[PDB]
Amino acid sequence: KKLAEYKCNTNTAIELKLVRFPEDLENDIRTFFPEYTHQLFGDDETAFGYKGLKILLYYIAGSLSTMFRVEYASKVDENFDCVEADDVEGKIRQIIPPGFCTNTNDFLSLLEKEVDFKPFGTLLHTYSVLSPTGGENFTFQIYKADMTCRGFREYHERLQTFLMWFIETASFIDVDDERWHYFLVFEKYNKDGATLFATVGYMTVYNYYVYPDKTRPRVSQMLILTPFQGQGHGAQLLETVHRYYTEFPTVLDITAEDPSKSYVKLRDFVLVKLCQDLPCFSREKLMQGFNEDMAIEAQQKFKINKQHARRVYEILRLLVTD
Amino acid sequence: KGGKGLGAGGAKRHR
Ligand SMILES: CC(C)C(=O)SCCNC(=O)CCNC(=O)[C@H](O)C(C)(C)COP(=O)(O)OP(=O)(O)OC[C@H]1O[C@@H](n2cnc3c(N)ncnc32)[C@H](O)[C@@H]1OP(=O)(O)O
Fold first, then answer.
1. What DSSP designation does A84 have?
2. Are residues A61 and A145 in the same domain?
3. Other beta carbons less than 10 A from residue A161's beta carbon
4. Which one of A181, A225, A250, A308 has the minimum C-beta count within 10 Å?
5. How far apart are the CA of A69 and the centre of ligand 1, in A?
6. Residue of A169, A178, A182, A255 to mutate, interface with B, max B Cβ within 10 Å
7. Which of B8, B12, B15 is nearest residue A220 as measured by Cβ atoms?
8. Of ligand 1's atoms, which has the minimum distance to the CA of residue A264?
9. Residue B1: its chain A contacts at CB < 8 A?
10. Mutational pocket test of ligand 1: of A164, A208, A222, A225, the residue with most ligand atoms within 8 Å of the beta carbon
11. Spatial distance between the Cα atoms of A228 and A201, rounded to a whole number of angstroms
12. What sections of chain A are H helices per DSSP?
């Protein structure tokens, strides 16, 4: 045996799918891959002991009912290779809940009743991406959910695994803590003359206490699943979250826990969009330089943090000049 | 695990 062929990159070995139709199981276009596996498989992101290693994590599109299978062409034998294969199955079991199915027949049996899946919580926003060309239109909804919603706790356990693959320093939250808020994005779709809901992404926000009587909601985790990225959903989600908290006088403004470069770019885009038509951000105001009243209006109208209001100023100042 | 109110308490990747 060539042992080099028994070390495998876990970023390409882990195959993720979101399944709406049985044909999605055989369509490689529906397969997407982790950006991070270092929290399970080390800095090198490798598993040892298998050739042709495939780690299948397939999810029903809405409910995220899970199939988990480990496949391989061959593995090391301790009698002849004198070493044991990595416990890939046990490592994955550490970050997915029990009760997953282990074969495509049982997975397809669950897909038959996926029409029963409904979004959790309170509807905040509906939006459509309408064809300019006489083609397909797509329709999305954003909900605020909590652990009082039937089935949400178990769904969140299935969903949170995705953070390990897509956020470098993801860690699982304490859902017993009542200060956690949850914002969900679904896509509506039709199947067999019914209307179903597909999970698109989500955000967790910690309602951080500011003594004596205020909060400063902190964006903790935000994920738009790979197939939905770069299509405006993250911007709709962060805008909807700002608009939600805007209705609470006890909310000061919104921050983030350890924001990524991609998050900072998205936040700048969203907060510039919200501020651009505010009177304090007019061209004539911008040309006179940054004024505190810009941060005051941004905080009052949209719960924008003073640091972020200064960035909005800098970007809008660049926009009104050559 | 992260502390109270934390969802990004995991290890950074070092290549
Ligand atoms: C940092 C902490 C606080 C966290 O919340 S976790 C870290 C962030 N999450 C991750 O990195 C996980 C993996 N990535 C993702 O989940 C997502 O790619 C993301 C980073 C949440 C961004 O969401 P996406 O849905 O892909 O972004 P979109 O709404 O399409 O916006 C993309 C860009 O298109 C542009 N855009 C968006 N909507 C529009 C409209 N309507 N018109 C014009 N241009 C637009 C704008 O430049 C957006 O800014 P960037 O995201 O900064 O490039």
1. P
2. no
3. 20
4. A250
5. 31
6. A169
7. B8
8. 52
9. 171-172
10. A222
11. 8
12. 10-13, 38-41, 88-93, 104-111, 152-166, 233-246, 261-275, 283-287, 292-302, 306-319
A160 to each of A148, A152, A154, A253, B6, how far by Cα in Å? 18, 12, 10, 26, 14
Same domain, A189 and A245: yes
Structure method: X-ray
Same domain? For A160 and A26 the reply is yes
Best mutation target, A171, A182, A257, to test chain B (most B CBs within 10 A): A171
| Rounded distance between C-alpha atoms, residue A34 and residue A71, angstroms | 18
> What DSSP line would sit under A118-129, residue for residue?
---SEEEEEEEE
Which residue, of A106, A138, A168, is where some domain finishes? Answer: A168
Whether A125 and A219 map to the same domain: the answer is yes
CA A38/CA A81 separation, integer angstroms: 26
